[PDB]
Design a protein around this ligand. Structure first.
Ligand code: LKT
Length: 297
């Protein structure tokens, strides 16, 4: 008789599924390590009225498994100071991470441009927000490993969010740290001594990175006062492959980044507590939250 076909089952729409054909590239936003982030418009109506989104894709060069792990981490993080997961675009092994777009960008471009409207009180409120997002990440047993002002996005003049989780790793249950094997592109000037010499990553190692991020915040991310520029002035700049060993020696000696210009000593002492040589001796994120809240009174 008649040709047999398939009964069409009801097709429910997934709001976290972004079709490639409607995901239109506007410009590059940033990049890091094996990935890149682009501003796109998701435009199913094809009239330029669609929502603007930030799209993470792998740089052509392996790392598919890392991007998929990052998607699964971000998809399950829900915090006011953590960039919002929106969905995915699937290829086919390929995948793209869809996040909310924050037009003000990172603190690295925002602070040098908005010094006049961002006073100490606002800088301390951003510090609290970063600590709150980080404490939430730590409570879910994750280490960020790339905490720097460059990875902090501006939602508005009054709110910041951790904007990238490209290097985020889980800590094991009944364990205290993550062991790194791939360290070639490490942001060494933001790293705790245990990360540089023993390749161990603790929640206390993220507290060290926060201390350096706080210093950047207080210097309005000025390029000439950057953690890299300051440490290279301290140890020497032209040392090539000997730079990390010279940095470790400097930290063992008790030397640290100086107090930023116009930064009060009470704020500098909270920053120094992030830089205790032993991780067990360092301040916690909750203690930092209470320290800043006390200065905001
Ligand atoms: N945060 C941040 C800084 C960079 C990203 C860019 C990639 N990057 C990485 C870093 C390390 C490892 C890896 Cl694997 C990567 C990768 N990939 C950092 N950035 C994001 C925006 C941005 N701007 C507006 N809205 C946004 N919504 C989400 C993000 C976003 C602008 N610059």
């Amino acid at each position: 008789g008649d040709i047999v076909s398939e009964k069409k089952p009801a097709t429910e729409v997934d709001p976290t599924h972004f079709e490639k054909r409607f995901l239109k590239r506007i410009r590059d936003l940033g990049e890091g390590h094996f990935g890149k982030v682009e501003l796109c418009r998701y435009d199913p109506e094809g009239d330029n009225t669609g929502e603007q989104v930030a799209v993470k894709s792998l740089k052509p060069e392996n790392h598919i498994a890392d991007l998929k792990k990052e998607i699964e981490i971000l998809r399950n993080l829900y915090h006011e100071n953590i960039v919002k997961y929106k969905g995915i675009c699937t290829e086919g092994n390929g995948i793209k991470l869809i996040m909310e777009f924050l037009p003000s960008g990172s603190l690295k471009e925002y602070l040098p441009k908005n010094k006049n409207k961002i006073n100490l009180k606002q800088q301390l409120k951003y510090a609290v927000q970063i600590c709150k997002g980080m404490d939430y990440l730590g409570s879910r047993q994750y280490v960020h490993r790339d905490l720097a002002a460059r990875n902090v996005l501006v939602e508005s003049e009054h709110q910041v969010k951790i904007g990238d989780f490209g290097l985020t790793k889980a800590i094991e249950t009944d364990k205290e740290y993550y062991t790194v094997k791939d360290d070639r592109d490490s942001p060494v000037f933001w790293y705790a001594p245990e990360c540089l010499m023993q390749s161990k990553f603790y929640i206390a190692s993220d507290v060290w990175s926060f201390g350096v991020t706080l210093h950047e915040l207080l210097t309005y991310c000025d390029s000439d006062s950057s953690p890299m520029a300051l440490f290279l002035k301290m140890i020497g700049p032209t040392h090539g492959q000997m730079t990390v060993t010279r940095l470790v020696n400097t930290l063992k000696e008790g030397k640290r980044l100086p107090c930023p210009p116009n930064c009060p000593d009470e704020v500098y002492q909270l920053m120094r507590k992030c830089w205790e040589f032993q991780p067990s001796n360092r301040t916690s994120f909750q203690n930092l939250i209470e320290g800043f809240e006390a200065l905001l009174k």
